[PDB]
Design an enzyme around this catalytic site. Structure first.
Site, PDB file in Angstrom:
ATOM      1  N   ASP A  39      18.210 -24.292  45.450  1.00 46.31           N
ATOM      2  CA  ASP A  39      17.765 -25.061  46.609  1.00 46.31           C
ATOM      3  C   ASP A  39      16.328 -25.569  46.468  1.00 46.31           C
ATOM      4  O   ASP A  39      15.597 -25.148  45.565  1.00 46.31           O
ATOM      5  CB  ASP A  39      17.923 -24.215  47.877  1.00 46.31           C
ATOM      6  N   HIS A  40      15.925 -26.491  47.348  1.00 45.89           N
ATOM      7  CA  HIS A  40      14.583 -27.074  47.349  1.00 45.89           C
ATOM      8  C   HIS A  40      14.232 -27.762  46.036  1.00 45.89           C
ATOM      9  O   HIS A  40      15.034 -27.788  45.096  1.00 45.89           O
ATOM     10  CB  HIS A  40      13.499 -26.035  47.676  1.00 45.89           C
ATOM     11  N   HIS A  55      13.285 -28.998  52.586  1.00 46.89           N
ATOM     12  CA  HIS A  55      11.960 -29.325  52.075  1.00 46.89           C
ATOM     13  C   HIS A  55      10.880 -29.119  53.128  1.00 46.89           C
ATOM     14  O   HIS A  55       9.953 -28.330  52.934  1.00 46.89           O
ATOM     15  CB  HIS A  55      11.945 -30.774  51.584  1.00 46.89           C
TER      16      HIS A  55
END
Lengths: 493, 493, 106
Positions: free
Chosen positions: A180-181, A243
């Site tokens: 993720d991110h 984010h």
């Protein structure tokens, strides 16, 4: 510090985007001696592949969507660790066949036993895959098996909770990586070092000197492809939870006592546990929607949202957001945190602006009678650096002040950026350090914070009640009213 | 803005330096159409001169030491207004003749009855002149009469007190302008507007963070054709009393409540009332002196101090003078100051450096197990500006920190430059306000502060015991020991 | 050098309440020539962003004159000393809590 050799399994491979996202990266890593020469990859899925077919398709992928194959002898030296074992997703017999294949590969290739499992299946198959993986007991030893789950980790709070409960019952919460991110190893460490290594910037960070902060993230590309992907998500599960909720945590975090992942993650969760929206009862002072219509971009016409392929001309999926969060701890009591995002806005940029307070009493006169207060301007997008503005003296036989600023750009004293964020992510996954990943508590807390607005905007309503802004203007006027209700203005950027 | 008609009856008798410094300056100022168009100048000397005689003498001087006359008829128009009187400095008939001269020549435009007396003569003549002026009753109305006293005002505590008492009996204050040292405008105002108009710099001036201050000035020429005056002088009586002790007062002053001149001077007097030598008992811990010899400045050798045109074969006149001070009020308790000055040093810098404390604990280990603390480095000349030095992250893969900096220059980012300062001081004297003209308490305070070391150094001793330094080096070794005894270091500029 | 951050001890024969009191190596059961301590003192320090350089002193024991329990905090000295007064002004102000008989804050 090169990691020890091991074997990779790529569930749901031989599909789409897996080749262009994995093969060039691992090839470049191997060519740059990032891994020992004992690295192998294995395919999966149901379609009747072939080892020669695998080699041909990998060659095509690297040729078309990468720098190239380099030296032919290099590819010859590489091409020994690419096998295949066809099997259904929910077939325990295929799982036992995979276990036997892995055992044979361990006996022959001599990989010493350590393993990392990569998962890349469609997001609507995590529960069955994890349950059937745990059925055969492939994850028993602690440093022997690491499983990586791709985006996204559920949609609403209930789905995330169910996924967490399923995951908790199979393996210890020490091997699961939620990837993720996209924040790399540059910005996070740079910001932490800048904050926690100086003896001036720290005492001016509490609530008695700071007034408000703003966090902006903007993009210029349209919806582009993945219309089906976007229509089911919208820009609240795409950029405002993955984010934009990391800059907030990094900016409003209490100092740690160490450097390893434990203290950092504990402090982040502790900060995230004491936040809330502004007006929960009335959702008109804590949120504005939007949608981008036809306009002018780069001197060329660009169609509105309801003209792309695959999107019906009645959709109400937002492409803009604006919240007003507020912290409630012993340090940040009563200082709003305005957030932002969007699409089709001009001048792609990210920023973190902190605005200080005014002096107790004023004895001097301003040229414009405005007396702009000081600002810190941490930047994250290109031309990174720190800029601060203060007051000076107008030349002449009079006492007047004028706003001027210093500057310091990372691109002059530096500029040699690191490798692709994906390469560093993979290296960290191989070696093992959870600093850049996310725990369960962080995910659950972010979902709890955003739940009310998400539920309210999800409900059906009038088709033409969406506030609209053309492609190019900064935002619909409703956001301007939200920020001007108190007096502080949006950063002009 | 625009001053009033006035008569500048110079009392400085006949000289060369005084007229050369004044008459060209006032002529240039009048040429730039800033003073009132009609003005008068009265000449006083100790000789008989025809009007054309000193008229052409001044014409030759102004043509030699300027760009000539801007016009032709304007020269004669200006000269119509320049008269010469007859008298001496002791004859009562001299002042009687001057009174008759003024009372007859003030008929043109009536001069509104205003007068001013600029004094520029040898220092020993101040008491006789002031006594004769007081007995004669030249000035009685405290609205249109002013008296200007030039450097030096004295040489020790007793003489300064006696002169102050004598000049107090004649007239009240608000009329004496003790001009001498000139820290010109566009510097003091700059320092105020930078310090008292921001909310991020004032809360960082305490014993809590500031750890160390130091001030330095340096020249290159050393000793020149003014040997006739410098033979009876010293660093202590030339700089530390006139320039550095005003820079220190400006640095350590408390924030004033109003922009009036009276408040500023009152605050300066208040702060300069708790400053003392660090170790009064033993002068070897708070004082070092020196004298330069055998120089090599530039591409050619330069002779030493004891061997050059005009000397004392066995002399002890110093040229380098360090010092230490320690304010002990409620805000600057236990924070040391250092003052340093000298001649024949390579660069002519003059800066102010503030060094902040170290961080309470070091999570991050720097290079070579050491770190450079933050520094604020206000510069005065050349290229006035402000600089800061903080810490950032080396782009490596480890937690290695270097030091970067930010800058700001007034000249490049504001206008081009400024004008001369002597004309500004004369205009300010004309207008009738006293912002930078010292009051008659801080002179006594400075003399009291610097008296002990002055008395100790004034006692004659062995001429061979004077520490020396070759012209080009920064300082002799004893000053280095003084600074290093505690654990700090001179800033190599 | 552990001798700068801790001191042990042991109590011997003396007087407590006007009646003679036997020493530790006399009690019915202890072994003569023992080494088990009775009085202990330490000196701890805390390394964080709000307690840097403020030492803590701890104490305990047995057969001391009376039962108490205190947490004494001592504040710094005033910067300026215009009121020099008498007795060298060596009386900095403290804030002491109490967790024993006569509970209170003083």
């Amino acid at each position: 510090r090169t990691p020890e050799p091991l074997i990779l399994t790529i569930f749901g491979a031989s599909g789409d985007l897996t080749q262009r996202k994995l093969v060039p990266a691992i090839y470049q890593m191997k060519r740059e001696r990032r891994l020992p020469p004992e690295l192998t990859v294995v395919g999966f899925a149901r379609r009747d592949w072939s080892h020669d077919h695998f080699r041909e398709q990998m060659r095509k992928g690297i040729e078309e969507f990468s720098t190239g194959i380099g030296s032919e002898d290099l590819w010859n030296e590489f091409a020994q660790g690419l096998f295949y074992c066809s099997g259904n997703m929910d077939d325990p017999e295929s799982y036992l066949k995979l276990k036997n294949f892995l055992g044979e590969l361990d006996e022959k290739r001599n990989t010493r036993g350590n393993r990392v499992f990569y998962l890349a299946v469609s997001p609507n198959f995590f529960p069955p895959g994890i349950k059937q993986l745990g059925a055969a007991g492939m994850l028993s030893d602690p440093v022997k098996s690491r499983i990586v789950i791709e985006k996204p980790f559920g949609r609403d709070l209930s789905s995330a909770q169910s996924l967490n409960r399923v995951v908790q019952s199979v393996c210890k919460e020490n091997q699961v990586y939620r990837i993720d991110h996209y924040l790399g190893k540059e910005t996070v460490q740079n910001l932490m070092v800048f904050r926690f290594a100086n003896a001036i910037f720290e005492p001016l960070w509490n609530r008695q000197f700071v007034d408000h902060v703003q966090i902006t993230v903007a993009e210029t590309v349209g919806v582009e492809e993945r219309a089906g992907y976007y229509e089911s998500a919208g820009a609240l599960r795409d950029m405002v939870q993955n984010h934009l909720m990391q800059l907030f945590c990094l900016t409003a975090m209490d100092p740690p006592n160490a450097i390893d992942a434990d203290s950092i993650r504990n402090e982040k969760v502790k900060v995230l546990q004491a936040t809330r929206l502004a007006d929960i009862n009335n959702l008109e002072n804590a949120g504005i929607r939007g949608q981008y219509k036809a306009g002018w971009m780069g001197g060329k016409p660009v169609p509105g949202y309801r003209e792309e392929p695959g999107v019906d001309p009645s959709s109400t999926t937002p492409t803009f957001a604006a919240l007003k969060l507020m912290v409630d701890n012993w340090r940040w009591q009563g200082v709003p945190f305005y957030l932002r995002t969007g699409k089709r806005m001009p001048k792609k940029v990210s920023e973190i602006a902190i605005q200080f307070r005014q002096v107790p009493l004023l004895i001097f006169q301003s040229v414009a009678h405005q007396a702009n207060p000081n600002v810190l301007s941490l930047r994250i997008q290109p031309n990174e650096g720190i800029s601060l503005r203060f007051e000076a003296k107008m030349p002449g036989s009079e006492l007047r002040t004028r706003t001027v600023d210093m500057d310091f750009s990372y691109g002059s004293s530096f500029g040699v950026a690191a490798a692709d964020a994906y390469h560093r992510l993979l290296l960290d996954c191989m070696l093992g350090d959870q600093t850049l990943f996310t725990r369960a508590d962080e995910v659950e807390e972010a979902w709890r914070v955003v739940t009310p607005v998400l539920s309210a905007w999800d409900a059906p309503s009038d088709p033409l009640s969406m506030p609209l802004y053309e492609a190019g203007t900064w935002e619909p006027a409703e956001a301007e009213w939200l920020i001007n209700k108190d007096g502080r203005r949006w950063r002009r950027l």
